[PDB]
């Protein structure tokens, strides 16, 4: 791992672990969860952005782009590291890496990758957010999971915004949360597992 | 292909052909180059988002949420047909149908999912347009494409964009493009491609 230079200014205590490069916002909690779902050791780092960390010549060694989440697992194909930014990519090359958090059948598999890119200013912002909660309703309307049966990196990659969405004080009823009916049960089946809970908070902010 | 509503408003003239239904913008492109480059027989559908035609029960049905490009393939897994939304789902579908346009080795090919979700107003976009080509000019800094030697779905997923970013009067100049090398050396690569050619022109508008 010191051949990534992000290591130098977030150093690795567990080299035999997966590096998370993170902070607990809608887009970097897919990547926790997952983590936390799948069991895999991981060892997670908090990337300043009050203080532009994301813009060090470390952090863009490994994400040009300045974004967060990213990895570098060390146990990666071949068995060489393999540093990897894009929580969908992330999200799907730890699922393959498992074998866990995709359906079995092909046609479904696919299907699943298509919730990994989902989701005047407070208008806009409420609209959107409207529109976004009717399609996951809609969706959701006689499924336990946005692919049925099965939890999968599609509830991963979209519980933590919607928990996000209505985070704030008045959130919920600008939305006009409580006037779905699948969105809230959904939401609360995926709150309540324990690794959910866990990567929500991870890293530490 | 009855079962699909949408084919009751776009009717399918070649039920034995994968239906494209779409807008030559920068996200319907990155499909219809990716038809064009594999050989695949296809059918094209305009989506005319002048009438609305986006916010039909027939459009929606595929589509929830109302967004091009969207393919049925008539010759989906398990020989049924397969309705997918979402352009890099849809790349990476047709990547693995065809076995084309992805690196052989597994760690540059999770690398390249990383680039299919990679891209006052004015001068917003304008910085963001200069911020996006500096990562790719990083990127094809030393490379043909983005994956190296090889042409992937990370190409296709990207020139059209780039193409369309500096389509109009001034705008090569606002985002400072011709400062630039990788990037216009590898647009001028991409664009010498006649199945790119042929792509980003369909549907017709």
Redesign the interface.
């Known amino acids: 791992l010191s051949s990534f230079p992000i290591t130098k200014r977030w150093p690795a205590q567990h080299s035999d672990r997966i590096q998370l490069y993170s902070l607990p916002t809608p887009n970097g909690v897919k990547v926790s969860i997952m983590l936390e779902e799948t069991g895999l050791p991981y060892e997670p780092h908090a990337i300043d952005f009050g203080k532009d960390h994301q813009k060090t010549p470390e952090f863009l060694s490994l994400n ?2 300045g974004k967060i989440p990213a990895i570098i697992d060390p146990n ?3 068995d ?1 590291p ?1 540093g ?3 929580s ?2 992330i999200l ?2 730890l699922a393959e890496k498992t074998g866990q958090f995709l359906p079995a ?3 479904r598999r ?2 699943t ?2 919730w ?3 989701q005047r200013p407070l208008q806009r912002y409420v609209a959107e957010s409207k529109r976004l909660l009717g ?1 996951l309703e ?2 959701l309307d006689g499924r336990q999971w946005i692919m049925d049966a099965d939890y999968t990196i599609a509830d991963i990659a979209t519980l933590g915004w919607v928990r996000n969405l209505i985070g704030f004080y008045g959130a919920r009823e600008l939305v006009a949360f409580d006037e779905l009916t699948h969105v809230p049960a959904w939401l609360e089946r995926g709150l309540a597992r324990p690794a959910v809970q866990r990567g929500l908070e991870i890293p530490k902010r």
């Open positions: 040009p782009n990666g194909p071949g060489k393999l990897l930014f894009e969908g990519a799907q090359y059948d092909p046609a696919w299907q990758l298509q990994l890119h989902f399609v809609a969706r």
